[PDB]
Design a protein around this nucleic acid. Structure first.
Length: 91
RNA sequence: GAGCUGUAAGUAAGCUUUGAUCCAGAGAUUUCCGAAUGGGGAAACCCAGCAUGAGUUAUGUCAUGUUAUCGAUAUGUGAAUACAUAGCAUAUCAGAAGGCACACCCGGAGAACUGAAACAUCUUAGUACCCGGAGGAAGAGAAAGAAAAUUCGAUUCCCUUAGUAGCGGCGAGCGAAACGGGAAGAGCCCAAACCAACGUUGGGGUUGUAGGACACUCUAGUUACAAAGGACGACAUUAGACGAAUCAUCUGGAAAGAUGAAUCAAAGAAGGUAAUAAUCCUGUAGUCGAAAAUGUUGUCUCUCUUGAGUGGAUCCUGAGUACGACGGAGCACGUGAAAUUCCGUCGGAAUCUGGGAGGACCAUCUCCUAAGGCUAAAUACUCUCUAGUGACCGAUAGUGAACCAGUACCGUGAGGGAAAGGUGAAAAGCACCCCGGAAGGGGAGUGAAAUAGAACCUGAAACCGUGUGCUUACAAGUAGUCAGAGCCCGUUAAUGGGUGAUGGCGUGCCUUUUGUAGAAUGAACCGGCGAGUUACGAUUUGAUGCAAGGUU
RNA sequence: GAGGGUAGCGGAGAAAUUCCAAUCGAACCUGGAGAUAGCUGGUUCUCUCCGAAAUAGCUUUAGGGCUAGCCUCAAGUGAUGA
RNA sequence: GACAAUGGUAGGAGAGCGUUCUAAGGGCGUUGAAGCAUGAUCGUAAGGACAUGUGGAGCGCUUAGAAGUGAGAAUGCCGGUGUGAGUAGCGAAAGACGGGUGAGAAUCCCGUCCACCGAUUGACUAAGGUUUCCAGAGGAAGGCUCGUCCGCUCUGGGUUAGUCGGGUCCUAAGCUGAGGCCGACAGGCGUAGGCGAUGGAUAACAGGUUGAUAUUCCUGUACCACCUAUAAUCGUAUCG
RNA sequence: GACUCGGUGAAAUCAUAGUACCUGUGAAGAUGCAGGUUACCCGCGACAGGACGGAAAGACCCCGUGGAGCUUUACUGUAGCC
């Protein structure tokens, strides 16, 4: 659904409306780490680190107008491509 | 199509768009024990022969293959004993052996407690157990039949006939069938007479509205029975792919909730997501896809293939069988007037002008043709698969087992057998300071909440403690009830709440008994669990529809 | 002392109903099996109306059962009750 | 608005309360559901509301339907916790003192006296057990008290054979046996042949050494079986 | 051993208990009922009369149309033998 290094928007949670770059992925549990989201404080001094959120809480913005949208698959070329729902432009 | 190195957090060293892991169909490798099979043996071990190979100056050692016992088939196959029909040796073999599914099927063998209010005939019962065959089913099956109609026409299963006929120390109890309505539905091959070959099957032929041999007119079938061995196109099964439609505001640690305005539907089945989502995620409706491997089939291929036979004198069918007597068993039917069907022992028929049956037996009539074999479909059952369903369970429940359970543990052994689920949305699992040898604890910090800190959701009663308002050391108490001063409080607001100087009355509860304070029985206390239910028949009452008719 | 043999409708016994894995007048385990019990014990919420018997006959019967007699609920026939 | 009825066991009849689930309709809940705790509330009974604290996600109402639908007794089953009660007991026996260790010593370590066994409580070895053996480090639980200690916990170690005891040697009892005999089925007997010590045969001794092994390792001297090459009898042997 | 101190620390039993005596009464032998008499609250060491004291659904006795073992000229069968 969301690949590593793509740009997404937080749709739900405590940081709703925060653009970031995915920098990690956990497909086994469906969780993804997005930079600047879910910062947590650990005890071991206090080392602040970023927690992983649910993959169903982030959306990909349109390339042209930066609008959160769903991903489609036209599959014209021999390799399938990700197509933005709002506009056919590839995401 | 970007991540990966099982459960599992870490600590490491590494692989991967040259496309890793992961999923599916085919191949390779596969130690030792175990039918275990080279010989032994206390299974998972020990000890050998033969052949061919490396190693070693040689011996010791090592590696890869072969050697169990019984069957059916070659070869030699000279003992008592001069045919020889003992043994005895080698060769060949998708020949056997053992193991499951508390389940279904056929056969062998075969109890008891119990009921009859005792008990032996009888019943429970041809049931349990044991053994031995199998097969995806088995078994049965092409009339020596059912009957009495102006007849039907292989077997099996369901409804009905019916709790009827009948059986029975005629007690207790047991218990049919044929007609009629349905599911399914095809039937064939041998022996014999005879015709050709030197106890191989070569032809010929298969039966009752009588057949064949023998004399006589004369141009389709398929390996699921009916004889059996292959070549040839299309659908499904075992990984997948695409797949419509939402944005704000308020309360929150968090929106899917509330408040407004928009949307998709051949998709409003469901499961997740920091709370209750048709439009956030995985899916659903619908529509596509198969290297290679299985199964079901369709086509031509392949094999195999002569049918009506008018006469009718002579010939043919299945024997120690059919049947009888004696002793048993089986048919709903206990020897009874017991027909029909079987086993052991003896005696023993007929031959188409024959033989058998129609509930003893005879006559007449009617219907069939035994003593050889094979045969699919309608039926029974469920280890274990792939989809699903529930006015079923929700941790003392549900399988003994929601946890690594037939495991802790118990027994020499065969066997018996438990207890144990829940932090949070996210480990964000309390850095640091202080008391202490530690354990533990008080602060700080994380979080929405730490009376959520892993002996971790909620946290009832028994039971054990601390503080306090009233009360008690002259008193005889199933401990309560009615009457009633003083002292301390102030509620769901009303003829209020707590404590109790003193007076009247009063010998627990259950079970069982003519009768219990009873010294008759039962309970240490608290919690959970724990006993007239269901399926087929009969009868009566209420309700309801129709009515000389009602209902399948 | 070591290694062996005899098993329950059975073994062993210089004999006691003595022993066969800590209870043997007939061992242990699983199954038929929820054997049978005319005998004991137990059997869970609340109100309203009515309300007994402990007798007769028969009984392989006497602490069991059956019919009759006394209770209750309905539908009926009418002074037939005291 | 009138008169008349209402004690009750075994039993008969009638009307109701509450619990779980289901179908329709209509409603509450993070502005806090169920459950739990408390109170001076309502109805003829079984029972029904309301407020507050705790709790943190489900649950009432109306009519009808369907039941694993109501607990104080069964010497009832399972779990938890009392009473007796700070009561009985703490499993044959001689100990004392001075040092050491340590948070903590009648109980651990070292030393000196004393006491007990000595056909033995001493020294070796079969069966059986199966790491209980050694060293350093530990004190939650186990040890009938204590514990710094341990047959307890953690980490790392320890068993050396041609000759000792068993296999490539033999056999008793007994147990299994190709063919074979006998039996409803299984399977019961049994010959040749095999298996089977508690017995027969059979080549090593004395010292030394480790925290833990010794006829095994080491030092010094032996013996048995089997291989290889080279020399003695100048064979009509030799092996069976 | 018991008894007094330090350490450790069970069991049978148990309807709730603020648990006196005498004469009488009662299902006929009362801590609990009637009438009298006596008794300030709470411990420790001892004795054993009674709570029909506590361990075992009384083995004696009688009942069940209940079991099991044994005996015989009880009934009906049977191995075996002639």
């Amino acid at each position: 659904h969301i690949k590593k290094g793509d740009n997404v928007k937080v749709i739900a949670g405590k940081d709703k409306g925060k653009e970031g770059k995915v920098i990690a992925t956990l497909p086994k549990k469906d969780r993804v780490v997005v930079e600047g989201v879910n910062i947590m404080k650990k005890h071991q001094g206090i080392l602040e680190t970023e927690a992983a959120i649910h993959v169903s809480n982030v959306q990909l913005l349109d390339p042209k107008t930066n609008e959160p949208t769903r991903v489609g698959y036209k599959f014209v070329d021999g390799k399938k491509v990700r197509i933005a729902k709002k506009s056919g432009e590839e995401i």
